[PDB]
C-alpha cells in the first residue's frame, strides 16, 4: 500500500494581493530565473486551519498563543465543569513550564499550539496523580511510557497532527513534539509576473480636495501551483494509531481545502474568490512535486491557464515514464484538455475525485 | 558645499506636476531624464560636477513624497539633530534586517531600498544631516546608520 | 503614393530624450513620421517608422525589419486605425507675456475634454474619412529639453473611407502638430 | 438559508476617463497575459456611496474625514439643539482620542468614517454617564458589554456596515471596529482594450471590435450574517433589501458623468445573482480574453455561461441562482431561473431566491 | 568520494518575512521573522572506487560492488535532504543522470564554472552546458570508457528510463 498522497493544484486568481511582506509588497520568489508571485505555506496552512470547511468537516482548530493568562481564563471557562480550578492551573503550569499565578500577564517563551482536548486528558491524568500523592517527575515518567494515548487526543487537533509542533519548555518538551504529517510548499505562479501598482487616495469629505499624495499598493493576478503531500503512516501515528481509513478521510478534506480555500488577505477589496481549475491527486512511495513543470516559465497563449495545465500534463508524462511510477492517479479539470497519458483516471467532478481518495484510489 | 534647507524648501514648494513626475523614477540616474529635476537642482550647484552625485541621491530620497521626510530643527541644547537611523528606529515601522540588508547593498541597490524605507517610515529628522550623510555615503556613513538604528532601539526599549 | 514602413529600435543611450530620438532617427538616413511603441526597454526604444527614404542600421539606431509599401484603398470599406497626436487650441497668452516683435505671445494649449478631442479628430480627417468608433487614450505629458512640453492623445478605432487619395494624402503628410516628437503617424488596418 | 450572496455583473460602458492614476492615465491590470482596463474597487464603492440611488434607497452616507475641528463645528451645528456643546465636545474627544478645544486645526490619525447618528447615540451615553457619576473608564467598560446597541446606529451609515471601518485611537478602538460585510473586486474588462493588431503586417492586406465601449466584469458578494450583525442584529429581510440595492448599483453605476452605453434602451447588460455557502468569483471566465464578434458583450456572456456551467457542475453548486440577460446567447443549462426584467431579479433577491 | 552540490548558476537568495499570529491577542503590529530561501539547479557528483569497495567489504565480488554503486546512483538521483521540506516541499526528482566508467575519477563541475545564464529557465542550458563540456573533455583526454545518460528532456548511450540506466550499471556497462 502506498504511503504518500500527493496533491497538485492549479488555481488561477484575478487581480489580487494574497500575501505580502513587512512592507506591503507581494511576496515573490525566483524560479527558473524569473519572478513568480508567491503565497507562503504558512498563509495557506492557516487559511485552511481557520476555514469554515475545516470547522464543519474536521473539527476544532488548535489555539495558538503565547499569553498564558488569557489561555488560563479560557481553560477555566471551558473546562471548569469537569475539573477543579487549580487542577486546571497546575496542568497548564506543568505543560507550559511556567508558574500560573492569578497574575494577568504570563507569557510563554514563544507562541505555541494548544489543543484543548489534549489539555483535558492531561487534567485527568494529573487529578489521578494527586489522588495518589504521586510526584510530578514520576508522572512525567508514567506519561512518557504511553505516548499513543496522548496522540489520540489530536483527533481534536488535526491541524497539529498534520503540521507538527515543537515546544521548548514544560512537560510538552518531552511529551508534545509532533512530527507533522503534511508537507506543503509555497505556492508560486507558473509564469513570470511583473506586478501592477494601484495608485490610491482617500477623499476627505470636509476639505477641498486640491493636490494630494497618492498611496501605492502592489497587486497582480496569476496562475498558482499548489503542492502538498500527506504521509499516511505518519498521520496514523500522530492520531494515536488511527486506521488508514481515517487518514484517507482527513487527506480527502485536505484535498478539498487545497482546491478551494484562498487566503483572506485583501479580499474585501480585491475579491479573488477563485476555485481551482485543476486538481490532481497521486499515490506514491516517494513524494514528488511537479513544480519543475514550470521551471521554464510558462508563456501565455490564450491565457496562462491552458498552457500551465498542458505543461503539468507533459511533465507528468515525462516523469511517470522515466522513473517508472505505478501509483494510483486521478485528475479533475474544469477544462477539456489535451489528454494526459491514459494511466490517469479522469474525474468529472471534485467530489468524485474525493470519493476516489477515500477509497484508497481504487473506486 | 550644497545648501540643504534651500533644496528642501524648493522641494516643498515645487509644483505638484513636476513633483509627481519626479517621484516616478525608480533609480537615481533616471532623474537625469527629467527636466523638472534640472530646474530644481540647478540653483544649488548642479552645474558643478563635484556636487552632482550627491544631488542625485538627495532628490531621490526626497522623491519619496513631498512630505514623507519631515524636517525638524535640532534643539539648541543638542549639538546635532535627529539622524536618519534614529528616526527610522523611532518610527517603529522598520525591521532591523531591512537596515542590515540596506548597508550591505551595493551602490544603487542601496538608494532604492532606502527610499522604500523612507516612504514606509515617514521619518522626522534633521534634514541637512541626512544631506551630509548622502553627500559622502561611504562604508562608515552606512555603518553609522546601522549604529544609530540599533542603539536607539536598544535605548528606547 | 509609395512609402516604407520599418520597425526600428534606438539604444537607451540615445533614447534618453524626445529630441535625441528625432536625431537618432535622421542619422540613419543620408522626411518621415514615427510612432513610439515601447519607450524604454533595457535594449532601448522600439519605434514604427514611416518614411520616404531607406533606413540602414547604425550604432545606436538598429533597424529590425523593413518592407516597402504603397497604398491601395477602396472607398466605402471600413478600417481600423491608430493615431497619436496633440490636439491644441492657439490663444493669446492670458499671462500676457510678450514676443520679440513686441506684442503679446501666442500659446498652444491642449484640449482636455474627450468630446473636444474627438471633434478635433473628425475635423482633422474631414472629408477623407468618417470616424465610426473612437477611443481617445489619455497619455502622460511629454517633456523635452530649447525646453518644453507637449500633451498627446492616442486615438484607436474604426473609420470609413470617403476619399481614398485624400486619406492617403493625410497618411503621408501626418496629422497634427509636433510631427517630429512622435505624433502624426496614422496607421490603418483591414477590419 | 445560504449565508453568502454572489453578484456577477457584465456592464458595458466607456473605457476612458473613469479611474486615473497619478499621471493622467486610466487604470488597468494584467489578466491572463493581456492588459484589461480597470476600475478600482475604492472608486466603485465611493461612486455607489455618493450616488443618488443610494441617497434615495439606502440613506445618508458616512462622513469620512480627518479634520476633527471641522467635524466639531459640524457636530455642533447638527446636534447643538439636542445636547449641550460641552457634551458634544466631550464625546468627540472620547471617540477620537484627541482634545477638542476651539483651536483652528485638530487632526485625527487617519481619515475615518463617521456616522452622525452614531455620534449622537454616544452623546446620549456620555450625558447619561455624567448624570450617573460614571468615570470614562467604567463608561468604556459598560459600553463594551452591548455592542449591537452601537451597531444599530449603522442603519444610518450602511456604507460602513458594508465595507468596514478601523480606528487607531479613542474609544472607537474597542467600540468602533467594524468588519465589512461586502467584498468587492476591481472591475476588469473581459477583453483586451488595446486594438488586437500588428500594424506592420496589416498594411500589406489593405468579428469587429468596439472602442467607445467596453465590457467590464464586476464581482461582489455580501455576507448576510455579517451584515445583520453590523446593522445591530437586523433581519435577513433588511439584509436582502440592502443587498438588492447593491445588485442594482453594481449593475448600473459608472463613476463620473458617464453612464452605461445603452442606458436609455435597456436597464442592465447582464446580471446574475447566486446564493451559496462559500463565495466564488467568476473572473476566470475571462482569463482567456474574449475576442469580439458583434462587439464584446455576447461573446462575454457566452464565456460567462460556459464557465458557470463547468464550475457549477464540477464543484457541485446547488444553491439558488437567477440571471437577467436579454441577449440570445446559448442558454445556461443549470437550474438558473431566467428573469425577463431587472426589477424581477431584484425582487427575486428581495425574496431570498424563490419568487 | 562525493562533492558538495552547487548550483550551476548564480543565486541571490530571497527572504520570506513571516509572522506568528496570536489567536488571543487582538491584532497589533508585530515584528516579523526572516528565512532565506531560493530555488536552483544543482549539480551533484560522486564517484565509487570499486576496488576499494570490494576490499572494504572483506573481498566481495565486483558484482556486489556494482550493485551497491547502482543503489548509490538511485539515491543520488532521487534523495533530497529533509531540511525545511515540511514548509517548502522541494520534492523534486533529477532531470538528468549520467554514469561513466573510468580509470581516473573526474568531475564535471567545470562545465558550470562559467555560470549558466538563464534562457527558458536554468535547466536546459545547464544540461546543454554539461553535454558540451563532456564532449570536450572526452575528446581531449581520450576517454574510452563505458558511459550512459538518462534524461527527461528530448558515444554516450541514451537511456529512456532510470531503471535501464541502473541495469546498465549493474551489468558493468555492457
Coordinates of C-alpha atoms in Angstrom, one line a residue, chain D residues 10-329:
Chain D
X10 CA -21.4 42.3 -17.0
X11 CA -21.6 46.0 -17.7
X12 CA -20.9 47.8 -20.9
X13 CA -19.6 51.4 -20.9
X14 CA -16.8 53.7 -22.0
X15 CA -13.2 52.6 -21.2
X16 CA -11.9 56.1 -20.7
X17 CA -11.9 58.9 -18.2
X18 CA -13.1 56.6 -15.4
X19 CA -10.4 56.0 -13.0
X20 CA -7.0 57.5 -13.5
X21 CA -3.7 57.3 -11.6
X22 CA -1.2 60.0 -10.6
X23 CA -0.3 60.6 -14.2
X24 CA -3.5 61.2 -16.2
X25 CA -3.7 57.5 -17.3
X26 CA -6.6 55.2 -17.0
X27 CA -6.0 52.4 -14.5
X28 CA -5.5 48.9 -15.9
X29 CA -4.5 45.5 -14.9
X30 CA -3.0 42.4 -16.5
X31 CA -5.1 39.3 -16.6
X32 CA -4.2 36.1 -18.4
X33 CA -1.4 37.9 -20.1
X34 CA -3.5 40.7 -21.6
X35 CA -3.9 44.3 -20.4
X36 CA -7.5 45.0 -19.3
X37 CA -8.9 48.3 -18.3
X38 CA -9.7 48.5 -14.6
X39 CA -12.0 50.5 -12.3
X40 CA -10.8 50.2 -8.8
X41 CA -13.0 49.0 -6.0
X42 CA -12.5 52.1 -3.9
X43 CA -13.8 54.0 -6.9
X44 CA -16.8 51.8 -7.3
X45 CA -17.6 51.9 -3.7
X46 CA -17.4 55.6 -3.4
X47 CA -19.3 56.0 -6.6
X48 CA -22.2 54.0 -5.2
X49 CA -22.0 55.7 -1.9
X50 CA -22.4 59.2 -3.3
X51 CA -24.9 58.1 -6.0
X52 CA -28.5 59.3 -6.0
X53 CA -29.8 55.8 -5.9
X54 CA -28.1 55.3 -2.6
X55 CA -29.3 58.6 -1.3
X56 CA -32.9 57.7 -2.2
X57 CA -32.9 54.0 -1.3
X58 CA -30.3 53.3 1.4
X59 CA -29.9 56.5 3.2
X60 CA -27.3 59.1 4.0
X61 CA -23.7 58.1 3.5
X62 CA -21.0 58.2 6.1
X63 CA -19.0 61.3 6.7
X64 CA -15.3 60.4 6.1
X65 CA -12.7 62.9 7.3
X66 CA -9.5 63.5 9.2
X67 CA -10.4 67.1 10.2
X68 CA -11.7 66.9 13.8
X69 CA -12.0 70.6 14.2
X70 CA -14.3 71.0 11.3
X71 CA -16.2 67.8 12.3
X72 CA -16.5 69.6 15.7
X73 CA -18.2 72.5 14.0
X74 CA -20.4 70.2 12.0
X75 CA -21.5 68.2 15.1
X76 CA -22.2 71.4 17.0
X77 CA -24.4 72.8 14.3
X78 CA -26.2 69.5 13.7
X79 CA -26.6 68.3 17.3
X80 CA -26.4 71.6 19.2
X81 CA -30.1 71.7 19.8
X82 CA -30.2 68.3 21.3
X83 CA -27.2 68.3 23.7
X84 CA -25.0 70.9 25.3
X85 CA -21.9 71.9 23.3
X86 CA -19.8 70.6 26.1
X87 CA -21.3 67.1 25.9
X88 CA -20.6 67.0 22.1
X89 CA -17.0 68.1 22.6
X90 CA -16.6 65.5 25.3
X91 CA -18.0 62.8 23.1
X92 CA -15.9 63.6 20.0
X93 CA -13.0 63.8 22.3
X94 CA -13.6 60.4 23.8
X95 CA -14.2 58.7 20.5
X96 CA -11.3 60.3 18.6
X97 CA -8.7 60.3 21.3
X98 CA -7.8 63.9 20.7
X99 CA -8.6 67.0 22.7
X100 CA -11.4 69.2 21.3
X101 CA -10.7 72.8 22.2
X102 CA -11.5 75.8 20.0
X103 CA -8.2 75.6 18.1
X104 CA -8.2 76.1 14.4
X105 CA -6.8 72.7 13.5
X106 CA -7.2 69.3 15.1
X107 CA -6.2 66.2 13.1
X108 CA -7.1 62.6 13.7
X109 CA -4.6 59.9 12.9
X110 CA -6.3 58.9 9.6
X111 CA -9.3 59.6 7.5
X112 CA -12.1 57.8 9.4
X113 CA -15.7 57.2 8.6
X114 CA -18.2 59.0 10.9
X115 CA -21.9 58.4 11.3
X116 CA -23.6 61.4 12.9
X117 CA -26.4 59.2 14.2
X118 CA -23.8 57.1 16.0
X119 CA -22.1 60.1 17.4
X120 CA -25.4 61.3 18.7
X121 CA -26.1 58.0 20.4
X122 CA -22.7 58.2 22.1
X123 CA -23.6 61.7 23.2
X124 CA -26.6 60.2 24.9
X125 CA -24.4 57.7 26.7
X126 CA -21.9 60.3 27.8
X127 CA -24.5 62.7 29.1
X128 CA -26.2 59.8 30.9
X129 CA -22.9 58.8 32.4
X130 CA -22.4 62.4 33.6
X131 CA -25.7 62.3 35.3
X132 CA -24.9 58.9 36.8
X133 CA -21.5 59.7 38.2
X134 CA -19.5 57.3 35.9
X135 CA -15.9 57.9 35.1
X136 CA -14.8 57.4 31.5
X137 CA -13.2 54.1 32.4
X138 CA -16.3 52.3 33.5
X139 CA -18.2 54.1 30.7
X140 CA -16.0 52.3 28.3
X141 CA -16.4 49.2 30.3
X142 CA -20.2 49.1 30.1
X143 CA -20.3 50.2 26.5
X144 CA -18.1 47.2 25.7
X145 CA -20.8 44.9 27.1
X146 CA -23.5 45.7 24.5
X147 CA -22.0 46.5 21.1
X148 CA -25.1 45.6 19.0
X149 CA -26.7 48.7 20.5
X150 CA -23.9 50.7 18.8
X151 CA -24.3 48.9 15.6
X152 CA -28.0 49.7 15.4
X153 CA -26.9 53.2 14.5
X154 CA -25.1 51.9 11.4
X155 CA -28.5 51.8 9.8
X156 CA -27.8 55.4 9.2
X157 CA -24.4 54.6 7.9
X158 CA -24.9 51.5 5.8
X159 CA -21.8 52.0 3.7
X160 CA -19.8 51.4 6.8
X161 CA -21.6 48.2 7.7
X162 CA -21.0 47.1 4.1
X163 CA -17.3 48.0 3.6
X164 CA -16.0 48.2 7.2
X165 CA -14.0 50.6 9.4
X166 CA -10.9 50.6 11.6
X167 CA -9.9 53.0 14.2
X168 CA -6.5 53.6 15.7
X169 CA -7.3 55.7 18.8
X170 CA -10.1 56.8 21.0
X171 CA -12.9 54.6 22.4
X172 CA -13.5 53.6 18.8
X173 CA -10.6 51.3 19.0
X174 CA -12.7 48.9 21.1
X175 CA -16.2 50.1 20.2
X176 CA -15.8 51.2 16.6
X177 CA -14.0 48.3 14.8
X178 CA -16.4 47.2 12.1
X179 CA -15.6 44.2 9.9
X180 CA -17.1 44.8 6.5
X181 CA -19.8 42.5 5.0
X182 CA -19.4 43.2 1.3
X183 CA -16.4 42.1 -0.6
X184 CA -15.9 43.7 -3.9
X185 CA -13.3 43.3 -6.7
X186 CA -11.8 45.6 -9.2
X187 CA -13.7 45.9 -12.3
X188 CA -11.8 44.5 -15.2
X189 CA -12.7 44.2 -18.9
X190 CA -13.3 40.8 -20.2
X191 CA -11.3 41.6 -23.2
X192 CA -8.2 43.3 -24.4
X193 CA -8.7 47.1 -24.9
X194 CA -5.6 47.7 -27.0
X195 CA -6.5 47.1 -30.6
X196 CA -5.5 43.5 -31.4
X197 CA -3.3 44.4 -34.3
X198 CA 0.2 44.2 -35.7
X199 CA 0.2 47.3 -37.8
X200 CA 3.3 46.3 -39.8
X201 CA 1.8 43.2 -41.4
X202 CA -1.6 44.8 -41.6
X203 CA -0.6 47.5 -44.1
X204 CA 0.1 44.8 -46.6
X205 CA -3.5 43.5 -46.6
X206 CA -5.3 46.8 -47.2
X207 CA -15.6 39.9 -35.5
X208 CA -15.5 43.7 -35.3
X209 CA -14.1 45.5 -32.2
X210 CA -15.6 48.2 -30.1
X211 CA -13.7 51.2 -28.9
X212 CA -16.1 53.7 -27.5
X213 CA -17.5 50.9 -25.4
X214 CA -16.0 48.0 -23.4
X215 CA -17.3 45.1 -21.3
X216 CA -16.4 45.0 -17.7
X217 CA -16.9 42.2 -15.2
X218 CA -17.9 43.3 -11.7
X219 CA -17.9 40.9 -8.8
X220 CA -19.1 41.5 -5.3
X221 CA -20.5 39.3 -2.6
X222 CA -22.4 40.0 0.6
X223 CA -22.1 38.1 3.8
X224 CA -25.6 38.2 5.1
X225 CA -24.8 37.0 8.7
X226 CA -22.2 39.7 8.8
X227 CA -24.5 42.4 7.5
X228 CA -27.1 41.6 10.0
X229 CA -24.5 41.7 12.8
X230 CA -23.1 45.0 11.6
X231 CA -26.5 46.5 11.5
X232 CA -27.2 45.7 15.1
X233 CA -29.0 42.4 14.5
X234 CA -31.4 43.3 11.8
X235 CA -33.4 40.7 9.9
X236 CA -32.4 38.7 6.9
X237 CA -35.1 40.7 5.1
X238 CA -33.4 44.0 5.8
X239 CA -30.1 42.4 4.7
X240 CA -31.6 41.2 1.5
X241 CA -33.1 44.7 0.8
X242 CA -29.7 46.3 1.1
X243 CA -28.1 43.5 -1.0
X244 CA -30.7 44.2 -3.6
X245 CA -29.9 47.8 -3.8
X246 CA -26.3 46.8 -4.2
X247 CA -27.1 44.4 -7.1
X248 CA -28.8 47.4 -8.7
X249 CA -26.0 49.9 -8.2
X250 CA -23.3 47.4 -9.1
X251 CA -25.2 46.6 -12.3
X252 CA -25.8 50.3 -13.3
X253 CA -23.3 52.8 -11.8
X254 CA -20.4 54.3 -13.7
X255 CA -18.1 56.7 -12.0
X256 CA -18.2 60.3 -13.1
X257 CA -20.6 61.9 -15.5
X258 CA -20.5 58.9 -17.9
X259 CA -23.1 56.1 -17.8
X260 CA -23.8 52.8 -19.5
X261 CA -23.5 52.9 -23.3
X262 CA -27.1 51.6 -23.7
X263 CA -28.5 53.4 -20.7
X264 CA -31.6 54.7 -22.5
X265 CA -32.5 51.4 -24.1
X266 CA -32.1 48.6 -21.6
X267 CA -31.6 48.7 -17.8
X268 CA -28.7 46.4 -17.5
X269 CA -26.4 44.4 -19.8
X270 CA -26.1 41.2 -17.9
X271 CA -26.7 40.3 -14.3
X272 CA -26.5 37.1 -12.4
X273 CA -27.1 36.6 -8.7
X274 CA -26.3 33.3 -6.9
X275 CA -26.7 32.2 -3.3
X276 CA -24.0 30.0 -1.7
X277 CA -22.1 28.8 1.3
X278 CA -18.7 29.9 0.0
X279 CA -18.2 32.9 -2.1
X280 CA -16.7 32.3 -5.5
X281 CA -15.9 34.7 -8.3
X282 CA -16.4 34.1 -12.0
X283 CA -13.5 36.2 -13.3
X284 CA -11.8 33.1 -14.6
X285 CA -14.3 33.0 -17.4
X286 CA -12.2 35.7 -19.0
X287 CA -8.7 34.5 -18.2
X288 CA -8.7 33.7 -21.8
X289 CA -9.6 37.2 -23.0
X290 CA -12.8 37.4 -25.0
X291 CA -12.5 38.0 -28.7
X292 CA -15.0 40.2 -30.5
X293 CA -18.0 39.1 -32.6
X294 CA -20.6 41.8 -32.9
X295 CA -18.7 43.7 -30.2
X296 CA -17.7 42.1 -26.9
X297 CA -20.9 41.8 -24.9
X298 CA -22.4 38.5 -26.0
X299 CA -19.2 36.7 -26.5
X300 CA -18.6 37.7 -22.9
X301 CA -21.9 36.4 -21.9
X302 CA -21.2 33.2 -23.7
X303 CA -18.0 32.8 -21.8
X304 CA -19.7 33.6 -18.6
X305 CA -22.3 31.0 -19.1
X306 CA -19.9 28.2 -20.3
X307 CA -17.7 28.8 -17.3
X308 CA -20.7 28.9 -14.9
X309 CA -21.8 25.6 -16.3
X310 CA -18.4 23.9 -15.9
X311 CA -17.7 25.3 -12.4
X312 CA -21.2 24.6 -11.1
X313 CA -21.2 21.0 -12.4
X314 CA -17.6 20.3 -11.3
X315 CA -17.8 21.7 -7.7
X316 CA -21.5 20.8 -7.2
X317 CA -23.3 24.1 -6.6
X318 CA -27.0 23.6 -6.0
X319 CA -27.7 26.9 -4.4
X320 CA -30.3 29.3 -5.7
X321 CA -29.4 31.3 -8.8
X322 CA -31.0 33.8 -11.2
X323 CA -29.9 35.6 -14.3
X324 CA -31.0 38.6 -16.4
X325 CA -29.8 39.0 -19.9
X326 CA -31.8 39.9 -22.9
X327 CA -29.2 38.6 -25.3
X328 CA -29.8 35.4 -27.1
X329 CA -26.7 33.6 -26.3

